[PDB]
Amino acid sequence: STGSATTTPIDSLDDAYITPVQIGTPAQTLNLDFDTGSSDLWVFSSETTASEVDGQTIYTPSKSTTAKLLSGATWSISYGDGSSSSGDVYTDTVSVGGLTVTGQAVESAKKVSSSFTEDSTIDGLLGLAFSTLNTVSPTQQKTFFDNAKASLDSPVFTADLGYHAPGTYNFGFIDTTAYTGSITYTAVSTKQGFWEWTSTGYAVGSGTFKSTSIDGIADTGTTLLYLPATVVSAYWAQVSGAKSSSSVGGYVFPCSATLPSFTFGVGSARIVIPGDYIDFGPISTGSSSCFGGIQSSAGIGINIFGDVALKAAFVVFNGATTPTLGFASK
Numbered sequence: 001s002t003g004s005a006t007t008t009p010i011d012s013l014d015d016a017y018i019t020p021v022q023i024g025t026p027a028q029t030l031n032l033d034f035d036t037g038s039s040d041l042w043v044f045s046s047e048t049t050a051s052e053v054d055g056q057t058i059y060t061p062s063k064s065t066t067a068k069l070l071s072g073a074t075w076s077i078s079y080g081d082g083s084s085s086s087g088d089v090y091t092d093t094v095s096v097g098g099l100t101v102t103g104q105a106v107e108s109a110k111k112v113s114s115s116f117t118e119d120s121t122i123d124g125l126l127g128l129a130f131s132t133l134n135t136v137s138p139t140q141q142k143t144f145f146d147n148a149k150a151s152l153d154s155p156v157f158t159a160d161l162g163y164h165a166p167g168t169y170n171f172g173f174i175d176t177t178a179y180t181g182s183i184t185y186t187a188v189s190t191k192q193g194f195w196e197w198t199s200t201g202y203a204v205g206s207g208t209f210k211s212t213s214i215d216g217i218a219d220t221g222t223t224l225l226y227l228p229a230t231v232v233s234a235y236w237a238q239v240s241g242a243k244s245s246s247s248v249g250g251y252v253f254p255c256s257a258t259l260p261s262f263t264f265g266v267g268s269a270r271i272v273i274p275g276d277y278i279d280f281g282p283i284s285t286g287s288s289s290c291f292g293g294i295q296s297s298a299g300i301g302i303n304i305f306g307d308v309a310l311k312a313a314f315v316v317f318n319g320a321t322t323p324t325l326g327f328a329s330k
């Protein structure tokens, strides 16, 4: 089997991407944030504290004839950005772009933190990291990809995120028309539960490539590109007037600037992030100070190849017995 679904930016800045997901019988379609940095599929629901719902579409398990409460199961997640959610668990039928999994753990939110409430466009998350990170207790549950794997034509999914435009998540096949050149594959460590790999270096604009190992994760659920402070300093030093602002929380730059590209290495191959992809607009409405899309990972504890980097490439998440990651230009 295969599946193919369009993913759409939630706003004009590509702050996140939402993908429609059918849950239950009859289908209830929710727009979920596909997150290769976490491993819980959770949804706003009829059980979510009413004051914490503000425009989201909710899953109502009592209206699904295939929903079954998973007895005694609870979940609770504290995300790296300080957000959180928790609740109970149903199993139900979940379909993504024509691909159907029966008996998928659907984690129903009873509580969500303010940042989720305040984003009316995201109805929940669909985790695509490794199932070892799933938070369901006392019986850990599998991700949608792990459940579908055996049925897929090939045990892979691909992320093709658009710049200020829709893109595609495919399951079970590689669309050879969706990229240019060849896909370069690179080794993955699952030791932290992430799609963790090692970039071979970087370049800033037209500058020379610096060969240096950068360990990080491929994370569709992170907006920006978080890299070591040395790398980030070298990038913003090429932007006149750019500075790191403690009050804003990262590098900012004059909105009048033309940003240089950023290149990262995948083995001997190179992925080029155009400068425009690094512009996340005014720090506040009407400001002429703009927020940078490349930020320091210092104090995160890990480098993150988030959407800024991933949307410059066609990315293969290969879930073979030994997982790997593939990157192609497009």
Ligand SMILES: NN[C@@H](c1nnnn1CCc1ccccc1)C1CCCCC1
Pocket: 035, 036, 037, 038, 079, 080, 081, 082, 219, 220, 221, 222, 223, 226, 300, 302, 304
């Ligand atoms: N999508 N899973 C990330 C996440 N969890 N919560 N937010 N992010 C977005 C990333 C981020 C990093 C720093 C500041 C703000 C946001 C995890 C972050 C911590 C490492 C594991 C992945």
